[PDB]
Design an enzyme around this catalytic site. Structure first.
Site, PDB file in Angstrom:
ATOM      1  N   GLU A 212       0.811  -1.075   0.196  1.00  0.00           N
ATOM      2  CA  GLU A 212      -0.071  -0.046  -0.157  1.00  0.00           C
ATOM      3  C   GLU A 212       0.713   0.996   0.005  1.00  0.00           C
ATOM      4  OE1 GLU A 212      -3.452   0.513   2.573  1.00  0.00           O
ATOM      5  OE2 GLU A 212      -3.647   2.546   1.399  1.00  0.00           O
ATOM      6  N   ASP A 214       1.099   4.920  -0.277  1.00  0.00           N
ATOM      7  CA  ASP A 214      -0.002   6.169   0.273  1.00  0.00           C
ATOM      8  C   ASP A 214       0.660   7.382  -0.381  1.00  0.00           C
ATOM      9  OD1 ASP A 214      -2.877   5.442   1.193  1.00  0.00           O
ATOM     10  OD2 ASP A 214      -1.428   4.120   2.464  1.00  0.00           O
ATOM     11  N   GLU A 217      -2.826  10.898   0.961  1.00  0.00           N
ATOM     12  CA  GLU A 217      -3.579  11.107   2.219  1.00  0.00           C
ATOM     13  C   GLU A 217      -3.714  12.406   2.483  1.00  0.00           C
ATOM     14  OE1 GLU A 217      -4.475   7.320   4.111  1.00  0.00           O
ATOM     15  OE2 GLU A 217      -2.333   7.330   4.593  1.00  0.00           O
ATOM     16  N   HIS A 228       3.639   1.390   2.854  1.00  0.00           N
ATOM     17  CA  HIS A 228       3.619   0.205   4.013  1.00  0.00           C
ATOM     18  C   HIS A 228       3.931  -0.945   3.258  1.00  0.00           C
ATOM     19  CE1 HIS A 228      -0.186   2.773   5.362  1.00  0.00           C
ATOM     20  NE2 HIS A 228       0.036   3.158   4.378  1.00  0.00           N
TER      21      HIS A 228
HETATM   22  O1  LIG Z   1      -6.450   5.320  11.451  1.00  0.00           O
HETATM   23  C1  LIG Z   1      -6.417   4.537  10.236  1.00  0.00           C
HETATM   24  C2  LIG Z   1      -4.887   4.978   9.434  1.00  0.00           C
HETATM   25  O2  LIG Z   1      -3.828   4.695  10.237  1.00  0.00           O
HETATM   26  C3  LIG Z   1      -2.660   5.401   9.644  1.00  0.00           C
HETATM   27  O3  LIG Z   1      -1.513   5.280  10.616  1.00  0.00           O
HETATM   28  C4  LIG Z   1      -1.884   5.988  11.762  1.00  0.00           C
HETATM   29  C5  LIG Z   1      -2.677   5.358  12.625  1.00  0.00           C
HETATM   30  O4  LIG Z   1      -4.191   5.142  12.463  1.00  0.00           O
HETATM   31  C6  LIG Z   1      -2.583   5.624  14.383  1.00  0.00           C
HETATM   32  O5  LIG Z   1      -2.900   4.321  15.192  1.00  0.00           O
HETATM   33  C7  LIG Z   1      -0.894   5.618  14.427  1.00  0.00           C
HETATM   34  O6  LIG Z   1      -0.513   5.801  15.946  1.00  0.00           O
HETATM   35  O7  LIG Z   1      -0.545   7.054  13.744  1.00  0.00           O
HETATM   36  C8  LIG Z   1      -0.503   6.857  12.299  1.00  0.00           C
HETATM   37  C9  LIG Z   1      -0.549   8.006  11.598  1.00  0.00           C
HETATM   38  O8  LIG Z   1      -1.678   8.384  11.050  1.00  0.00           O
HETATM   39  C10 LIG Z   1      -2.230   4.850   8.544  1.00  0.00           C
HETATM   40  O9  LIG Z   1      -1.127   5.402   7.820  1.00  0.00           O
HETATM   41  C11 LIG Z   1      -3.359   5.078   7.246  1.00  0.00           C
HETATM   42  O10 LIG Z   1      -3.255   3.963   6.478  1.00  0.00           O
HETATM   43  C12 LIG Z   1      -4.732   4.191   8.066  1.00  0.00           C
HETATM   44  O11 LIG Z   1      -5.909   4.732   7.156  1.00  0.00           O
END
Ligand SMILES: OC[C@H]1O[C@@H](O[C@H]2[C@H](O)[C@@H](O)[C@H](O)O[C@@H]2CO)[C@H](O)[C@@H](O)[C@@H]1O
Length: 430
Positions: A212, A214, A217, A228
């Protein structure tokens, strides 16, 4: 699953360009097609198989469902799902209201003919596009990105799916798409968990997991750059307590990285960079070139004709630079002091491999029922606040709540256009 017959599929024709040299590109006349879930499912007597956020008794199992039901084309793409196409430009409407119903969000794939996806090589290349998310507000996320999907979209790997990529089947991603209504071509009916606040969505036993990247966003208040990896970047089905991301009981119980290595200028400590009226003024259109190289991913801006670099992070412990190299993904977590998902699935090396996995590109818009995008544009997690990487955006910790955002900002729209691709140095001479 079989293909429907009550409504022919017509893909909106989109142009993007293959470059060799900085101002050496041209016209590729591909197309686009929205995801399977957004699609009508019914039998041969035309009773639904999916109604509201519940499968019907018109069905019954993972398997028979795939035989007896058929997904359809989307009719009109503007009156039903606010999808707008013109030349290069691709527009998406947050909130489509239409005589029969009201759709929120859309997620497309750039194509290669109506039967397959325009697949991208990533390692050694860079993407370019022009985005105007000028009217994208908090609680929303306007997304452009890659995810190692299958070309023909599961039709082949998964014979049951005889509708495939042509109908935008096959989405996967580093959460594991638990909410789709088909995975591998055999349903999620078997114990579908519905959402109390999303009358159309739900969750089912299987996910669809894979690479994935990204690139995009964001909204008019922030942005994150997020690669990721997984322990199987290749498309794959997981199993129930062995599925990750956010639709699950344990986020980190997947073979993939739900959070990954993220670069958000606001989270890394620069709240003056991005926004309407900011340095990288988000009240309009700009260009955002992103860069894929062995243990390095670079992202840079182009606005008002100018090269805007992306500022480095402020915190003690973090490398003197904005790029996403192994270096950054060694200290940010230990400072942000959280579970290093990245590391456990096998660090940047794994990400390297994934940067060789041929993936499909997506543009999209959606609201966040689980965390109302605060992860992207506010302070997340609430729990405390005041900590490194706590603040990601300028947006209140009130915002996101799909119902409220869906009702107040319904003309909300994002425009993707002038997608440009080729080796590094080739799409812009910067
Ligand atoms: O919440 C979904 C979103 O997560 C993203 O990573 C986050 C995460 O949600 C959180 O638990 C963490 O501590 O912080 C990170 C930074 O946002 C992820 O990057 C996304 O793909 C996902 O949709």
């Amino acid at each position: 699953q079989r293909a429907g017959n009550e409504t022919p599929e017509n893909h909106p024709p989109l142009t993007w360009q293959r470059c060799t040299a900085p101002g050496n590109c041209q016209t590729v006349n591909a197309e686009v097609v929205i995801d399977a879930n957004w699609r009508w499912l019914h039998d041969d007597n035309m009773q639904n198989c999916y109604d509201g956020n519940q499968w019907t008794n018109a069905c019954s199992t993972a398997t028979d469902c795939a035989e007896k039901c058929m997904i359809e084309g989307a009719g009109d793409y503007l009156g039903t799902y606010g999808a707008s196409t013109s030349g290069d430009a691709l527009t998406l409407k947050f909130v489509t209201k239409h005589e029969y119903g009201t759709n929120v969000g859309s997620r497309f794939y750039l194509m290669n003919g109506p039967d397959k996806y325009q697949m991208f090589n990533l390692m050694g290349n860079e993407l370019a596009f022009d985005v105007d998310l000028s009217t994208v507000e908090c609680g929303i996320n306007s997304a452009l990105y890659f995810v190692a999907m299958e070309e023909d979209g599961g039709m082949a790997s998964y014979p049951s799916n005889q509708a495939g990529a042509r109908y935008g089947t096959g989405y996967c991603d580093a959460q594991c798409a638990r909410d789709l209504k088909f995975v591998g071509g055999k349903a999620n009916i078997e114990g579908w968990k519905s959402s109390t606040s999303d009358p159309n969505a739900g969750v089912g036993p299987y996910g669809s997991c894979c690479a994935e990247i990204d690139v995009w966003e964001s909204n008019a208040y922030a942005f994150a750059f997020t690669p990721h990896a997984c322990t199987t970047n290749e498309y794959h089905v997981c199993e129930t307590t062995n599925c990750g991301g956010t639709y699950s009981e344990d986020r980190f119980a997947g073979k993939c990285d739900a959070n990954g290595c993220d670069y958000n200028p606001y989270r890394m400590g620069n709240p003056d960079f991005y926004g309407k009226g900011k340095t990288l003024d988000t009240s309009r259109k700009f260009t955002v070139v992103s860069r894929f190289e062995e243990n390095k991913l670079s992202q840079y801006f182009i606005q008002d004709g100018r090269k805007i670099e992306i500022p480095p992070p402020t915190w003690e412990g973090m490398p003197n630079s904005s790029e996403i190299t192994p270096e950054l993904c060694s200290t940010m977590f230990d400072v942000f002091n959280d579970r290093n998902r990245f590391e456990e699935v096998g660090g940047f090396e794994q990400l390297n491999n994934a940067l060789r996995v041929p993936m499909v590109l997506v543009m999209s818009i959606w609201d966040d029922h689980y965390a109302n995008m605060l992860w992207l544009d506010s302070i997340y997690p609430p729990e405390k606040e005041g900590q490194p990487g706590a603040a990601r955006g300028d947006c209140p910790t009130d915002s996101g709540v799909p119902a409220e955002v869906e009702a107040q900002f319904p003309d909300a729209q994002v425009v993707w256009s002038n997608i440009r691709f080729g080796p590094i140095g080739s799409t812009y001479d910067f």
